[PDB]
Design a protein around this nucleic acid. Structure first.
Lengths: 36, 598, 185
RNA sequence: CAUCCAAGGAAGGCAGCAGGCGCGCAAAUUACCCAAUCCUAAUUCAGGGAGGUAGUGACAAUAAAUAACGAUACAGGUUGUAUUGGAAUGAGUACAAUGUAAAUACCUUAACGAGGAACAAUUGGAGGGCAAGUCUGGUGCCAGCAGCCGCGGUAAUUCCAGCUCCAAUAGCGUAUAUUAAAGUUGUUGCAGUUAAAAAGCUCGUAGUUGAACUUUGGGCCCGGUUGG
RNA sequence: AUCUGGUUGAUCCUGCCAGUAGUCAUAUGCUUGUCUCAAAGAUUAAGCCAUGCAUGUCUAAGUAUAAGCAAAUACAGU
């Protein structure tokens, strides 16, 4: 059902955009796996 | 008393003389196959695909023996390979009869598995052969291919296929990393050397008995049956019983070595004591779904006496703490009890019996023997030519003819999702013998009182214990469970596998029923309950049995209220209309008897 | 037997495994320059470690010691040739101030992006590995190739590829044929 | 120790190459060739399991694929999230030539060879040490987890399963030994009142160690190197 | 040229246990697409060995009547 994740070089490209663009700050202490 | 320091010399000397002992043992073990006077190794060929024809395998092997004089409308062969001074006996089973395949493999030293490079192994037959053979035990195994050229374009295309087959074979026999290609002389020679030079593994349950493969069979008149062959197991004694797989137990009057050993008759003897399918399947499918959600629940109804329906039952506080008596006098108990054998410590009895048996052995491995069996002459019509069909004879241990309460482990076969009702008859094979059994299922637990819950159906997932009355086995043989089904291409439905655990009569099984009712009015210290009962006389009669909610709270009856069988009760805490109130009643279950099967 | 073949390991692993500040700084480099591994960063810091060790040793020698003059000048000459060290900083004390970004800047993968030709460092890497870029006459398909200052004028598309002047590729040709077959009804 | 036999007799030494048994946690083909390197002989020519070639081979080492780019819709200060379109390429297969003693493979190349690009990356973790979950279902101090501190007896941040997330990545985990951490072996460089550790006391041989003093100062030429 | 967790009601110490990084150091588990290069029955048993092979050699120039081959009456090629 869900698509596969890319591998190698293309995966580091993905991580880079999470942590330095689409950040969630939650009282200034950014969090990586926020409980919904 | 003084402490001692090891000098270089005595260090050296001790290591040397320990090596000598090790070396003497290896010779001692290989002696059984030592040469042209020694025993033959028993090879069974099993093609996993109908394509193959087993005689093509045997042909390619003998080409490497470098003796055309070795190399026909028969299925058992004796061969001497002078190149290795080796004696072989080759057995080919008739691949039509699934049960006959298992029997030939049971006596083998090496099983040779044939694989096809052209055609895929079938899930419904080829796989089931491999899976089943593993679970009864295998002495050793070799993987072989014989038709690999049939896919040739270049040899590199052959190797792609061979790597696929090696991966497949290693899934079942992970100790093996190579599959031999018999179309290459070097590989085919490599296989032949292994069969001659290498010792097999033992089979524990087999080698603690005696067994022989018949060389000749003959009858003498009121009947007497003569067999001769080579002893392989722990050995035979003329005072012990003798099993033959299709015909049951028999007694022997003489042993002789090709000294004579008559039956001395201070011995034991042959005695055991001292469209409906659519409706039925749908019924179990519906019932098992219900019991999976609402186990053991029973409905009383209006205009029914709760007493006479249920007066048989006891009612108890907790299974793991009750003082239920073992040999209770209750009339449902089976007609045999003192007649049944009772053992106590199975472990200490088992190993003690074996230790004596090897000491009392009259004929031993490698002996040439003739055997005279007291055989009812009317069965003679069922004997087949031993050059076409495998005929084999097994020893019994002293008390293995006597019935007792026995327990088995059970878990489901690879993908058998069908419901299994507890009372339904099943066929069980353990060791060589097989019996029709009606089991009872329970979860394994460590109850200090040996009381355990009876269950209606086999759990979908966990291992569980099955109980019945059957003859004892002192070798803890593995067990395979199946039901006959002549519509299937192999006439058999495989259900599960496990092991013979012990003989133990102190195992108590409690059948359980649940009554249930609705709380509907609530007060700070009392609750009143509907629909569990319908007359005040019933409500009073059961008053002493404890109550529980399925939310796990506990309570007790106070008294009857009114005429319609309402009652009021007290509980640990705040119930509410979403809760249900229940009470359970217990009844002793006893094992059913069992019968031989064919 | 024949004499042994010599070989050596070319990278070194950091000694504290889960230091949060280091982990962030490394991921910024990988995203900026289009690397695939942390190993590609460990390789560069391993090289720089050896360079500092050599220079740090020579600086204990007396000035005009003949060894300091000979080996010191060679080391500087070599780093200027690839453009890691500026021709203004042509002194042994400035060698100690080099840092990892100065080496990453000279990889073929990043040069092919600064020149045009490619529109991202991720697009650049694919072109190199797919044999489209030549350096002078030679096709080069390794992204970590270090571009010497003389070579920069000569980076261009390879003669034997599309973009460089050859016939269209396999997929372009297939499409034209199938269309012509349908049009050549 | 051990082989053959006509029972009179005869023959033996793989810690050379390949191969077998045994042992054990623990280790490859009974293949091709003198073309190269060299050696021996009465010799340019013969011979060479010395040596070379290929097979098995995640011991260790180097380089490095598993996707790139537009349009459209929506959101936002040129960057994100999802409907759609052409391009590019080797893994693999193969005519040929090259390679080679003859071959296999590498390098080169006509034809063929991507849309869940199914031509689908794993191995360990998510209380602390130590990067990363008040998520959701189950269970009953039990099954289990746990290097250490500990968790679990319905209300589990630690068990089991599902989502999501983290780390290294064609590699990752475990056991045993050893190096650093260790100024917990201390020459550099430890400690001995009360925490482990100054011997009841004095004499004394080997060993280690042992106060101060003897030509100091002052003139005159030559004089090389570096710096201004 | 770097350390962190554990003795207490709480604190400062002595001290060890656990954690951390490497190994041209071995074994083993799971997984495995491409190019170059490459160790390999040492550890325990300097234990025992079926079969085949591993040492021979000639130039114009020591000895020729092969009843060998091939075509200058003592001989004369190979």
């Amino acid at each position: 059902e869900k698509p596969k994740k890319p591998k190698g070089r293309a995966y580091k490209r993905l991580l880079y955009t999470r942590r330095f663009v689409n950040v969630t700050l939650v009282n200034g202490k950014r969090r990586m796996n926020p409980g919904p | 008393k003084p402490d001692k320091q090891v000098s270089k010399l005595q260090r050296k000397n001790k290591a040397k003389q320990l090596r000598a002992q090790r070396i003497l043992d290896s010779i001692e073990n290989r002696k059984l196959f030592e040469g042209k006077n020694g025993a033959a190794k028993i090879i069974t060929i099993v093609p996993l695909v109908n394509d193959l024809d087993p005689l093509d395998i045997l042909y390619k092997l003998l080409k490497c023996a470098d003796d055309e004089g070795i190399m026909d409308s028969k299925r058992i062969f004796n061969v001497h390979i002078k190149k290795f001074k080796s004696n072989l006996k080759i057995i080919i089973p008739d691949m039509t009869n699934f049960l006959n395949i298992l029997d030939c493999a049971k006596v083998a030293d090496f099983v040779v598995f044939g694989l096809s490079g052209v055609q895929e192994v079938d899930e419904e037959f080829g796989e089931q052969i491999i899976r089943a053979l593993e679970l009864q035990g295998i002495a050793s195994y070799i993987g072989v291919i014989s038709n690999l050229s049939a896919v040739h374009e270049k040899e590199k295309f052959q190797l792609d296929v061979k790597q696929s087959l090696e991966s497949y074979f290693k899934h079942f026999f992970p100790s093996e990393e190579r599959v031999y290609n018999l179309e290459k002389n070097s590989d085919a020679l490599n296989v032949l050397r292994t069969l001659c030079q290498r010792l097999p593994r033992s089979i524990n349950w087999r080698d603690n008995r005696g067994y022989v493969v018949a060389d000749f069979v003959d009858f003498v008149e009121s009947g007497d049956l003569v067999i001769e062959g080579t002893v392989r197991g722990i050995g035979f004694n003329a005072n012990r019983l003798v099993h033959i797989p299709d015909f049951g137990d028999f007694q022997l009057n003489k042993i002789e070595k090709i000294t004579v050993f008559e039956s001395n008759m201070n011995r034991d003897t042959l005695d055991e004591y001292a469209e409906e399918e659519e409706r039925q399947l749908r019924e179990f499918r519906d019932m098992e779904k219900e019991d999976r959600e609402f186990p053991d629940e029973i409905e009383l109804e209006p205009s029914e006496s709760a007493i006479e329906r249920l007066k048989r039952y006891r009612g108890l506080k907790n299974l793991y703490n009750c003082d239920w008596q073992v040999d209770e006098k209750d009339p449902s108990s089976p007609a045999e009890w003192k007649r049944l054998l009772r053992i106590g410590n199975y472990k200490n009895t088992k190993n003690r019996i074996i230790k004596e048996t090897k000491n009392e052995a009259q004929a031993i491995a490698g002996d040439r023997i003739r055997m005279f069996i007291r055989f009812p002459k009317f069965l003679l019509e069922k004997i087949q030519d031993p050059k076409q069909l495998l005929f084999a004879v097994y020893g019994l241990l002293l008390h293995e003819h006597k019935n007792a309460v026995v327990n088995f482990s059970l878990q489901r076969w690879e993908q058998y999702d069908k419901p299994v009702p507890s009372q339904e008859p099943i066929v069980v094979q353990y060791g060589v013998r097989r019996y029709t059994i009606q089991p009872l299922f329970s979860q394994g637990s460590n109850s200090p009182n040996n009381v355990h819950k009876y269950e209606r159906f086999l759990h979908p997932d966990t291992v569980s214990v099955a109980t019945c009355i059957a003859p004892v086995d002192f070798t803890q043989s593995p067990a395979i469970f199946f039901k006959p089904s002549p519509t299937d291409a192999k006439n058999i439905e495989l259900i599960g596998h496990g092991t013979f655990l012990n003989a133990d009569h102190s195992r108590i099984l409690a059948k359980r029923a649940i009554l249930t009712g609705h709380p509907f009015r609530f007060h700070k210290t009392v609750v009143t309950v509907r629909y569990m009962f319908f007359r005040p006389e019933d409500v009073e009669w059961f008053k002493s049995i404890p109550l529980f909610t399925k939310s796990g709270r506990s309570g007790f009856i106070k008294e009857s209220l009114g005429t319609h069988g309402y009652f009021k009760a007290t509980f640990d805490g705040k119930l509410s209309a979403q809760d249900v109130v229940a009470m359970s009643l217990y009844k002793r279950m006893w094992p059913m008897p069992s019968l031989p099967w064919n | 037997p024949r004499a042994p073949r010599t070989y050596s390991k070319t990278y070194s692993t950091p000694k504290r495994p889960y230091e949060s500040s280091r982990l962030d700084a490394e991921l910024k480099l990988a995203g900026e320059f289009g690397l695939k591994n942390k190993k590609e960063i460990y390789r560069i810091s391993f090289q720089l470690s050896k360079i500092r060790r050599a220079a740090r040793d020579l600086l204990t020698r007396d000035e005009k010691d003949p060894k300091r003059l000979f080996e010191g000048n060679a080391l500087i000459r070599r780093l200027v040739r690839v453009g890691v060290l500026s021709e203004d900083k042509k002194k042994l004390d400035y060698v100690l101030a080099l840092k990892v970004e100065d080496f990453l800047e000279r990889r073929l993968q990043t040069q092919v992006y600064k020149l045009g030709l490619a529109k991202s460092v991720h697009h650049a890497r694919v072109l190199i590995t797919q044999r489209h870029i030549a350096v002078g006459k030679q096709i080069v398909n390794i992204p970590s190739f270090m571009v010497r200052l003389d070579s920069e004028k000569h980076i261009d598309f390879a003669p034997t590829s599309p973009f460089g002047g050859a016939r269209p590729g396999r997929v372009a040709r297939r499409n034209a044929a199938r269309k012509a077959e349908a049009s050549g009804e």
